[PDB]
Every structure is written in C-alpha cells, then in structure tokens.
C-alpha cells in the first residue's frame, strides 16, 4: 500500500514527506500530505522563469543584466563567474533552472519587479494560475530558512503540481515559451538522484529541485512514459527533528519516486 510505503520512508529518514501526482485519464491522484505546506526552496525558479517569459516578448531573453559583488549571496555556480560581463535574461533563466543559480533567480525576481523585490509579482503570477495556496516572501538566501511550520515561502505538493501541469502540459504559456521552459527543465543538472532516480531509463524526466535548511529536499517533475503519456510528480520533504542543520536526504525522494513509478508503470 502506497500510504504505508510513504509512512515507512518517513520513519526511515526521520522526515516528513509530501507527494502529489494529479489524476489522469485512467489514474487517480496520488496524494500523501499533499495539502500540507512545505518550503518551496529552489523549486520556485520554475514558475519564476515562466512568469518572466510570460511577461515579456521572447527577445527580452537577449537583454543584458548587470550585477555586482554584493549580489552574490547564495549558491550561484554560473552567476559568480559573470559579474564583469553580466548575463542576459536567457542565460539567467538557464542558470536558474539548470544549475539552481540563486543569484540568477534573485535577478529574475528583480526583473519581474514590483514590491518585495519581485516576490509579490511572483505570487501574483501563481494566483493567475488558480494557486491560492503558495506564497513567496523572501529571495535567496532567506527563503530557505523559515522555521518548520512557518507559512512564509511555502507551497504544497498539490499546489505546485497543478501549477507545473499548467506550465508544461497546459496552456499557461504560448507554445514557444512553453518549449523554452520545458527544455531547460529537461536539461537540468541537479536532479539525477531524485525523481529521475526512481523512473526507468525509458521514461523521460524533466525536473526542478530544491534544497534548504531543516533537511529540506524537494523535486518537481513532469515525466513521460515510453508511449508518451505524461504525469506530473511533486515530492517534498523536511527533517525538523534534526534542527536547522539537518541533512537533506535525496534518497528519500528517489525511493518515494520509485514507489510512484511502480504504480504508474
């Protein structure tokens, strides 16, 4: 039994686990703690890139953004190398998704603009997609640090799955922008030990990960079966019992995904 398996994983990893897979043609929704709040962590960067793509003509991708030393305040594998040259909006989107570059995502929030350094406009973009649950209140590094249970900077597996479904499978974005987002997630470099690890090699997986304090580890994905049937998979976790420095456990997400894949196969 699924729920029994997910409960067993919680005990194994001293963790709280949330899972959602939306219903399809022939499968019921899979849900475990799906309406409980979990920190976004870096998973917000996927709808962030969608918001920026949606807000602007496509050639806004070619606009050069400049930044400085005091902008590097979080893990930023790409942006830390380009302070002198700047980065174009397209390079920022690529880095935010594929390398989970924190400076890149902060710069994209600023591009979106408005109150809260773009966090209010980000939240408004989610509201436009019918998500009345999620909220973004801070940028990096603060957004990964809220105490367990705090509602700041949170989504739920259910909410983020429905958002991702609209972005990748539905009509939230025009086809050209949808393809840009989908391809960046398809080329993600940070997800090999999470949802990807739980699905057989002949399933396609695109994803966006997040990791935070209090043992936070998330992954949101769209997967396609070998015959092209898509499913959206959101898996979220934290480990409050280990305190602020609790180690994130990727293996919990890989095992949860393996269980989901077993049901979807």
UniProtKB/Swiss-Prot annotation:
One of its GO terms (molecular function) is beta-lactamase activity. The record marks 75 as: Functions as a gatekeeper residue that regulates substrate accessibility to the enzyme active site. The record marks 45 as: Increases nucleophilicity of active site Ser. Is inhibited by clavulanate. It comes from the Bacteria. Keywords: Antibiotic resistance, Hydrolase, Periplasm, Secreted, Signal. The keyword Secreted applies. It is an enzyme of class 3 (hydrolase). It holds the Pfam family Beta-lactamase2. Its EC number is 3.5.2.6. GO terms for cellular component: extracellular region; periplasmic space. The active site is at 42 (acyl-ester intermediate), 140 (proton acceptor). It is found in: Periplasm; Secreted. Substrate binds at residues 100, 209-211. Gene3D superfamilies: DD-peptidase/beta-lactamase superfamily. Exported by the Tat system. The position of the signal peptide cleavage has not been experimentally proven. It catalyses: a beta-lactam + H2O = a substituted beta-amino acid. GO terms for biological process: beta-lactam antibiotic catabolic process; response to antibiotic. The class A beta-lactamase family has a specific amino-acid numbering system, sometimes called Ambler or ABL numbering and often misspelt as Amber. A multiple sequence alignment was used to derive a consensus sequence and then the consensus was numbered taking into account insertions and deletions. This allows use of identical numbers, e.g. for active site residues, despite differences in protein length. UniProt always uses natural numbering of residues, hence there appear to be differences in numbering between this entry and some papers. Belongs to the class-A beta-lactamase family. Extended spectrum beta-lactamase (ESBL) that inactivates beta-lactam antibiotics by hydrolyzing the amide group of the beta-lactam ring. Displays high levels of penicillinase and cephalosporinase activity as well as measurable activity with carbapenems, including imipenem and meropenem. Plays a primary role in the intrinsic resistance of M.tuberculosis to beta-lactam antibiotics. PANTHER family: BETA-LACTAMASE, BETA-LACTAMASE-TYPE TRANSPEPTIDASE FOLD CONTAINING PROTEIN. Monomer. This is Beta-lactamase. It comes from Mycobacterium tuberculosis (strain CDC 1551 / Oshkosh).
């Amino acid at each position: 039994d699924l729920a029994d398996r997910f409960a067993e994983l919680e005990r194994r990893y001293d963790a709280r686990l949330g899972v959602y897979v939306p219903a399809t043609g022939t499968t019921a929704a899979i849900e475990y703690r799906a309406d409980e709040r979990f920190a976004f962590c870096s998973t917000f960067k996927a709808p962030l890139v969608a918001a920026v793509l949606h807000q602007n003509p496509l050639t806004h991708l070619d606009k050069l953004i400049t930044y400085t030393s005091d902008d590097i305040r979080s893990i930023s594998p790409v942006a830390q190398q380009h302070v002198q040259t700047g980065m174009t909006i397209g390079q920022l989107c690529d880095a935010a998704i594929r390398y989970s570059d924190g400076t890149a995502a902060n710069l994209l929030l600023a591009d979106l603009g408005g109150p809260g350094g773009g966090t209010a406009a980000f939240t408004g973009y989610l509201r436009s997609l019918g998500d009345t649950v999620s909220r973004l209140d801070a940028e990096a590094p603060e957004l990964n640090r809220d105490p367990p249970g705090d509602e700041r900077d949170t989504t739920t597996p259910h909410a983020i799955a429905l958002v991702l479904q609209q972005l990748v499978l539905g009509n939230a974005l025009p086809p050209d922008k949808r393809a840009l987002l989908t391809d960046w997630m398809a080329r993600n470099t940070t997800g090999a030990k999470r949802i990807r690890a739980g699905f057989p090699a002949d399933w396609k997986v695109i994803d966006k990960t997040g990791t935070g304090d209090y043992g936070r580890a998330n992954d949101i994905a769209v997967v396609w079966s070998p015959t092209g049937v898509p499913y959206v998979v959101a898996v979220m976790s934290d480990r409050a019992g280990g305190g602020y420095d609790a180690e994130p456990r990727e293996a919990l997400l890989a095992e949860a995904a393996t269980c989901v894949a077993g049901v979807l196969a």
